[PDB]
Amino acid sequence: DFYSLIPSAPKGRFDGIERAHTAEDVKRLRGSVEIKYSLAEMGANRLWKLIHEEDFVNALGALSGNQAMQMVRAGLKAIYLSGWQVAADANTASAMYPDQSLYPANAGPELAKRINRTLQRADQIETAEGKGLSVDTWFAPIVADAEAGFGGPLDAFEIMKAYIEAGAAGVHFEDQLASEKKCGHLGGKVLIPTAAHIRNLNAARLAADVMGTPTLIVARTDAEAAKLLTSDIDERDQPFVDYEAGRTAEGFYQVKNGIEPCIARAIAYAPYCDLIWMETSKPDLAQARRFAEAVHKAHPGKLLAYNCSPSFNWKKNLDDATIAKFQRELGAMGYKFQFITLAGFHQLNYGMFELARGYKDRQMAAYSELQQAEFAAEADGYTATKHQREVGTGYFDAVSLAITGGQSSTTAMKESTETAQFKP
Amino acid sequence: TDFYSLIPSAPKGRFDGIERAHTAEDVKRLRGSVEIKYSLAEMGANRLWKLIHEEDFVNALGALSGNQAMQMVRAGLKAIYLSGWQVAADANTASAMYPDQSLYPANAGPELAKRINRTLQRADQIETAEGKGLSVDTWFAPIVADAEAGFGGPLDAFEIMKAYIEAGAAGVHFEDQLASEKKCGHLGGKVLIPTAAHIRNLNAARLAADVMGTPTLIVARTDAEAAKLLTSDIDERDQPFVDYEAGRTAEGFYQVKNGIEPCIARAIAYAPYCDLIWMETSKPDLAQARRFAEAVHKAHPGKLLAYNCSPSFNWKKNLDDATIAKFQRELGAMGYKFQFITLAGFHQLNYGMFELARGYKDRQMAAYSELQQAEFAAEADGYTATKHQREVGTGYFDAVSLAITGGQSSTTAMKESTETAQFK
Amino acid sequence: TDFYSLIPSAPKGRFDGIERAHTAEDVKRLRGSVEIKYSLAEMGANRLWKLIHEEDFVNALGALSGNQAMQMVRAGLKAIYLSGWQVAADANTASAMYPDQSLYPANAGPELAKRINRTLQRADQIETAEGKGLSVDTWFAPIVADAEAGFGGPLDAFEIMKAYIEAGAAGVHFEDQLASEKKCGHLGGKVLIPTAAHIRNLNAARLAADVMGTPTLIVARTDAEAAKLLTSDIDERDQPFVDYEAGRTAEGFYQVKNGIEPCIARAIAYAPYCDLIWMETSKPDLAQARRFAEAVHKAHPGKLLAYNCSPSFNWKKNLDDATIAKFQRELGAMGYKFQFITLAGFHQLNYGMFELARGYKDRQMAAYSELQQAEFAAEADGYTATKHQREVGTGYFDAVSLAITGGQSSTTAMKESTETAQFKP
Amino acid sequence: TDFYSLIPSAPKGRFDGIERAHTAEDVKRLRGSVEIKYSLAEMGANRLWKLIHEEDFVNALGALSGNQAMQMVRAGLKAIYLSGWQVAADANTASAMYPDQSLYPANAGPELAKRINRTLQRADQIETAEGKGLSVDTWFAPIVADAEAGFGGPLDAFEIMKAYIEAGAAGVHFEDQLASEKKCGHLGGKVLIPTAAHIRNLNAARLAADVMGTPTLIVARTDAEAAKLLTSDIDERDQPFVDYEAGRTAEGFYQVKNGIEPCIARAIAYAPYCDLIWMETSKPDLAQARRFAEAVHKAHPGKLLAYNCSPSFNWKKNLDDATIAKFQRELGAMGYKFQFITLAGFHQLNYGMFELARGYKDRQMAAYSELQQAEFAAEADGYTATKHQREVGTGYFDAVSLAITGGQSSTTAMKESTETAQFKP
Ligand SMILES: */C=C(/CC(=O)O)C(=O)O
Ligand SMILES: */C=C(/CC(=O)O)C(=O)O
Ligand SMILES: */C=C(/CC(=O)O)C(=O)O
Ligand SMILES: */C=C(/CC(=O)O)C(=O)O
Ligand SMILES: [Mg+2]
Ligand SMILES: [Mg+2]
Ligand SMILES: [Mg+2]
Ligand SMILES: [Mg+2]
């Protein structure tokens, strides 16, 4: 069966999960040798534990390894990897793009590798200091964006494998047309048929199976706002097609949007994913409850995911008490993975704009204020004021000393200004 | 033929007082047979040259991403600093976190310079397409970039200089450390190379700029204020600082008397082979900065200087508020025309995300809404990234799509976006 | 109102007969506020334009590495072909071996074009420093490169076009396949997009060249000879070929009647929006090539055409030796002015190393010495890489070192090399 | 106390005779808190360890691409060599052509090792999915890879070792040259580092493997046969070879008496800290190879040695045909159990494409059809790449598509391909 093919999968991991392929297909397609993907195994099993043990798992979108390291240091238990942020400031074309699948398909997995490598160094630093870790683990699970798979089922298969090699714990795929892909909160989205998205989800599961990892799959539907559909071939989509409207010049069908096609698609996708996610136009607890209840009528207890999107104007949509309870209330509905997709972008850009403005106005006064804020945050667990230790200078000092039997004349920390000027 | 005919964009006087070990005919022999233009490198170098002569001083912050650089320019800063320390920490081509020891691959700095220029390019495209003029003097603020110790010998310095020119950097700095033992200026264990050996690296950088045909600026850095080791006493200019009583180390290094005296001697020896001179210092000391400038200007009147306002200093520990507030202005009057906070982008990024993540853990969406409200508040001072879809170019690419389709595209993004509906 | 003023290096008449969906004011609006030069793209596009109008025909081989391209130029070929199939096989930015289905990341083709131009650049630097003139007309032979199906929609085609221009490509080809189901021209299971949709891709590529300011050539390819599937019948130009009795597939694809007739129709529709037209074919057939050329020229007299001399054909199975020998010459006379063997680099690389490895297993150094002697024997025909230290620039970087050091370096490489000692004539 | 528990896949006796500067507690302190497996590195190192103790000798060729490595394995070679010279020439992460002087970025060699393993993985997937067993003993032939002079100091050697292990290399070689003046072994101007300094690099590499938990092989290389310069005389083991009367060069280098004697002394000093020892030589000379082996074996009986069968030698100028034919066999009996032609991939690629391009210029499709017919004729000896669609995995991805769709995909590629139609047996 499939548990034999995925040895690290915990008991019950695939309860309720259907597959288009067989276990014999997996053995036929996985090659003749066992290659381990340790960070993917550990991350997927830790993510599986967390979303079932916590009241909910909340995360922020990280655009760099350092951002992810501070998220874990502050006590967050998972990391979100946003394709929007990859497009904006962290992709393999070295360009700034809007969120339209314009960057090359390897960019997401390359960012996941960067994040895991930073977490790996943070763990090496603390392990070498010999006083225990300052966190439960540095290897918080990464839930990562595979957009619409960058093409067809074989493209979804490849990006899933790439994320697994990079050490991602879960990967999400959405029912948009890859050639017209959009941020969930932009106009002009085009859906693919329900069956076509199920093929991408099955492609992602086959990839995890042939890699031997229990990687989580998140199915996302964009049907709340999308008014276009590539094809009406699937009888499940036809009730929503406005036939009197005719097709667009591109050949797209026009559909009725809203929660109703999201519920239908979510229920159809449920056997083929581990969590379900519906993009929404507004942060709306009542709408979130309606979606959860409808999904759970067909699929009791199904795990759900919710994008707490910065594309919403929060204090305009909601009062303060609702903002404060929002994630707790979603958690009780069954949204066990909640994430702020663009948080890293907004933090990075705001923080540097304000520092640069203060620097232009007051020069070193502005920077000393940041440094003093850093000092004040050390009581709350912040450590990066001592930047030489933070990036591993002490760790590599210890590597050098082990190589040289203690005798190297060129170690870094002893006579550093960090040691001299940042003493506790 | 002289060097001005080989570098067509060089302004009058660009090379006054500059000496070269090679000839103009060497440059013709070594540059290939076809003219290749490096437009951004030309523009940046000439803008940097004008700025450092006309401004009281040019101050910059170290940027670790294109978005950080974009906000620096938007806030009104006139130049961008590219720190090799930050490349090592969070932005290199080995996708690892490193201490500042030249551990990452030699292409990483130039790759980051290219990312920065690409983000600025898109920022300029967005505003140009909107048709209301630029909100900045120029988006292409000159980049002064870190080439460390050249990543080997003179040929390696030659190659990294060319790579930075291709990436569009305006100025590049090289230091007199041993590449195999390179350190951050404020770490211990630095090893100097002979004065003559660093002059070879600087000549290699100048030959690279000459054969690329660009008036790229060269900054010569000396680490002799703190370095206590030297690879070889072969150069008679270094022998007066060698502690021959101490004998050599187990690795064969000579021990040297460090401090401002060997910095002054090396700076005066380097001066004809660079455009700015930089001495790393252990403390932010205006009296020491004045003594260095006065000594250099005795031998080379009017020589432009650079100064590292390093986060490796504990600023309030060394200086009172009045001295911090006047620090850069007083340095500028001494001749320090380029001043930069090397690790500013690292500290801003890590502090900001630690504090957001900590608040998010404790209070979930209340913490994010506080950030969003701060962003809205900053718009009166020029911040724009709250509208993140515009910021990354969604409106620009909407305009591209409309030009392609003669106006008939059914799938543009901004019109029905939540940004348009919720961020007025 | 003039595009020539937006493209300073375009020669007189470059855009005769070329239509654009966008205006010159659109270009000015979308190109940013500063002029960035793309010198190798300018030089290559203009050299390619001259070549295809002055030579009887320009033939090329698919190069999968800079070294392959260098030897092509050294041997006297005037252009270089960059194959996406070979990128997928052995030279892509996912570091994987892929079949030809647009599975690799969209930057891989431009990155290979940059590698090729960098190798040619070093070859030119070596000979320029030696001071005895070049051994070729130019090292910077124009590169015609594969943008497959644009890797998505028109904006993706726009982006890969810009990337190829930055990398210094001279011409770029785009095909009317669905990128999510893209195939090699000679595989089954190809899915066409509507005629109008491919015209949008071609216009996006022209807009990219325009905003970059370069007269880069655009090649339009149709896969309609063999493709039996089509995403949508929305375009009335495609409806005459839709098999409505067969119905749609489970994916919703329309089934179409493939062959020469839809190729001719699509080619004539694409012609105002490209510089060369190319139809993939199932066999190397001179008669079919003439029929396609004649039909296109009935609508667009003198239109430049391109032809894939594909290794996916079994050549001696299809043709006798006399027809093989005259094949490219006859095509050139019909108007096929750019002809290319797509997978030549793959077959040369894999055949050559299989045979060397087999001989090495059998006979060890005897097999390698046979290669080295063959290299020596080819020097009379212009081969130089036997002296591999010179070939990769060791002498050039010696000259760099000597200019840096005033002539007095203890660590120059060539003087005491075994190359200088053992490879003298 | 024990290193075998830290390296779980290490076979019994793997570290016999091996000394370490560091302790087992150092490894535990420096390796992080989680077990990460490096499966290809384990399998390759253990297979290479087996091969060099069971074969008469293991011979290899330098591969510059995954496709080259795939054909080496298909032809029956049992290991793959990865040359930094070839990385510099045509396969590095700066996308430039370089002479062999450590000019490219330090990640380039490991990136090529990853490419090679990925191609081999696809080859194995193809044959596994076809269900008829493999056509080779294994597709995962061990890779022995070039780490040059470590790209800096001991910490740089530590990092490049880890990168090769992540990429799945089986063994890695490090040489006693100054990284800032690094040369190909057969160029002039080499500069040695002190004996103690190279031992520190070797120890850094072993610490890297220890913390990664892999039994990766380490090859120590000495360049003292031709190097006439030395950075420092601080090590008393080097002082007997320093020409003190000559003084230091202008750069501060000591001048040394080169030849076999400093190679023997350095090799004997390096032996506890590596698994194989390699001395670069100026000529392919069996007598010098025997003198070196006999002297190393007087101090370290049974020590395994490596030998570069370099294309930088003019083989027929140095040696008669009989000596060429027995060369590797004779070296094997002396203890040279890993033998490799460093630049074989460069010479095969460049010679093959020059001769193809020359014939194409002269005779167009006749030249290519000759290659294709040669390919057909090589199929009886096991060549398969004439069917290029199968070779790169098109049939494998067809099977993936059919598994995803339960047999229903309309867009599979092989059934109606020209390969199936025109390349039938
Ligand atoms: C752009 C979306 C996120 C996504 O991944 O679609 C948003 O606005 O949060
Ligand atoms: C590490 C230095 C900067 C540098 O580039 O050396 C510092 O502490 O500012
Ligand atoms: C795979 C084709 C080439 C192409 O680019 O489609 C062939 O067989 O030549
Ligand atoms: C350049 C050498 C090989 C090496 O790796 O040094 C040769 O000529 O074989
Ligand atoms: Mg996304
Ligand atoms: Mg630095
Ligand atoms: Mg192709
Ligand atoms: Mg080498």
Numbering used by the authors:
A (entry chain A): 3 to 426
B (entry chain B): 2 to 425
C (entry chain D), D (entry chain C): 2 to 426
Show the paper's wording.
The ACOD1 enzyme is mostly produced in mitochondria of macrophages, and converts cis-aconitate, a metabolite in the Krebs cycle, into itaconate. Itaconate has been described to act via the bacterial enzyme isocitrate lyase (ICL) which is part of the glyoxylate shunt that is exclusively found in prokaryotes, lower eukaryotes, and plants. This alternative shunt is activated in response to nutrient deprivation, a condition encountered by bacteria in phagolysosomes. On the whole, our results support a model in which the ACOD1 enzyme, via the production of itaconate, restricts Brucella replication in murine alveolar macrophages through a bacterial ICL-dependent mechanism.
Interestingly, structural analysis suggests the binding of itaconate into the binding site of B. abortus isocitrate lyase. The ligand is stabilized in the enzyme by salt bridges involving the two carboxylate groups of itaconate and residues Lys183, Arg222, and His187. A network of Hydrogen bonds further stabilizes the ligand inside the enzyme. Interestingly, this docking pose places the carbon atom of the reactive double bond of itaconate in close proximity with the lateral chain of Cys185, suggesting a possible nucleophilic attack by the thiol of this residue leading to a covalent adduct between isocitrate lyase and itaconate. We observed that the growth of the ΔaceA strain was much less affected by DMI than the wt strain. Complementation of the ΔaceA mutant with a plasmid encoding ICL renders it sensitive to DMI, which demonstrates that itaconate acts via ICL to inhibit the multiplication of B. abortus under our experimental conditions. In striking contrast with the wt strain of B. abortus, CFU analysis of lungs from infected mice showed that growth of the ΔaceA strain was not affected by Acod1 deficiency, demonstrating that ACOD1 control of B. abortus in the lungs is indeed dependent on the expression of ICL by Brucella. However, aceA deficiency does not prevent or reduce Brucella multiplication in the lungs, demonstrating that ICL is not essential to Brucella multiplication in this condition. This suggests that Acod1-mediated ICL-dependent inhibition of Brucella multiplication in our murine infection model is not explained by a simple blockage of the glyoxylate shunt or by the toxic accumulation of propionyl-CoA.
